[PDB]
Amino acid sequence: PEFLGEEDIPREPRRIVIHRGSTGLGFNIVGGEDGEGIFISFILAGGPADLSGELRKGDQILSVNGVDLRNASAEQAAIALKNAGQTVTIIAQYKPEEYSRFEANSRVDSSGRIVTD
Amino acid sequence: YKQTSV
């Protein structure tokens, strides 16, 4: 058997295009304080972000529809996302070490996966 | 700290 769980999670930036019409994207964000970055903390089962299959907890949102969010505040990030229109083009980059500082008892294992004890 | 659903 060949298990995905052993393979490294790609750390390069990716483009994700979510088509969600006029409903929520279906994920949570954390961060935004002092340019620390905006990270995905939670993806809703069955929501547009889940259906894309291309975002995960620990992804940093680098931009939405060309709008750089690397140094965004949490509220303006949310506004940017909520008002991005029916087609939402996200550049994301997996940053589990940075993300893990937000969630209690969390750490990164050898494959780059976020583990919570 | 701040967390929001989108």
UniProtKB/Swiss-Prot annotation, chain A:
Tissue: Expressed in brain (at protein level). Detected in juxtaparanodal zones in the central nervous system and at nerve terminal plexuses of basket cells in the cerebellum. Expressed in cerebrum. Expressed in hippocampal neurons (at protein level). Isoform 1 and isoform 2: highly expressed in cerebellum, cortex, hippocampus, and corpus striatum.
Entry's localization field: Cell membrane; Postsynaptic density; Synapse; Cytoplasm
Coiled-coil region(s): none
Domain PDZ: 15-95
Posttranslational modification: Palmitoylated. Palmitoylation is required for targeting to postsynaptic density, plasma membrane and synapses. Palmitoylation by ZDHHC2 occurs when the synaptic activity decreases and induces DLG4 synaptic clustering. Palmitoylation by ZDHHC15 regulates trafficking to the postsynaptic density and function in synaptogenesis. Palmitoylation may play a role in glutamate receptor GRIA1 synapse clustering. Depalmitoylated by ABHD17A and ABHD17B and to a lesser extent by ABHD17C, ABHD12, ABHD13, LYPLA1 and LYPLA2. Ubiquitinated by MDM2 in response to NMDA receptor activation, leading to proteasome-mediated degradation of DLG4 which is required for AMPA receptor endocytosis.
Record's subunit section: Interacts through its PDZ domains with ANO2 and NETO1. Interacts with KCNJ4. Interacts through its first two PDZ domains with GRIN2A, GRIN2B, GRIN2C and GRIN2D. Interacts with ERBB4. Interacts with KCNA1, KCNA2, KCNA3 and KCNA4. Interacts with LRRC4 and LRRC4B. Interacts with SYNGAP1. Interacts with ASIC3. Interacts with SEMA4C. Interacts with CXADR. Interacts with KCND2. Interacts (via first PDZ domain) with CRIPT. Interacts through its first PDZ domain with GRIK2 and KCNA4. Interacts through its second PDZ domain with the PDZ domain of NOS1 or the C-terminus of CAPON.
Domain notes for this protein: The PDZ domain 3 mediates interaction with ADR1B.
Role of this protein: Postsynaptic scaffolding protein that plays a critical role in synaptogenesis and synaptic plasticity by providing a platform for the postsynaptic clustering of crucial synaptic proteins. Interacts with the cytoplasmic tail of NMDA receptor subunits and shaker-type potassium channels. Required for synaptic plasticity associated with NMDA receptor signaling. Overexpression or depletion of DLG4 changes the ratio of excitatory to inhibitory synapses in hippocampal neurons. May reduce the amplitude of ASIC3 acid-evoked currents by retaining the channel intracellularly.
Protein name per Swiss-Prot or TrEMBL: Disks large homolog 4
Source species: Rattus norvegicus
Chain's gene name: Dlg4
Residues of the full protein shown: 302 to 402 of 724
Curated annotation (Swiss-Prot), chain B:
UniProt tissue specificity: Expressed in striatum, cortex, midbrain, Purkinje cells of the cerebellum, pyramidal neurons of the hippocampus and neuropil. Expressed in heart, brain, lung, liver, kidney and testis.
Region ranges (PDZ3-binding): 3-6
Reported impact of V6A: Abolishes interaction with DLG4. Does not redistribute DLG4 to microtubules. Associates with microtubules
Residues forming coiled coils: none
Subcellular location: Cytoplasm; Synapse; Cell projection, Dendritic spine
Region feature Sufficient for interaction with DLG4, mapped onto this chain: 1-6
Record note on what altering S5D does: Abolishes interaction with DLG4. Strongly abolishes interaction with DLG4
Domain of life: Eukaryota
Subunit structure as annotated in this protein's UniProt entry: Component of the minor spliceosome. Within this complex, interacts with RNF113A, as well as with SF3B1/SF3b155, SF3B2/SF3b145 and PHF5A/SF3b14b. Interacts with DLG4 and TUBB1. Interacts strongly with the PDZ3 domain of members of the DLG4 family. Associates with microtubules.
Similarity comment: Belongs to the CRIPT family.
Function: As a component of the minor spliceosome, involved in the splicing of U12-type introns in pre-mRNAs. Involved in the cytoskeletal anchoring of DLG4 in excitatory synapses.
Name recorded for this polypeptide: Cysteine-rich PDZ-binding protein
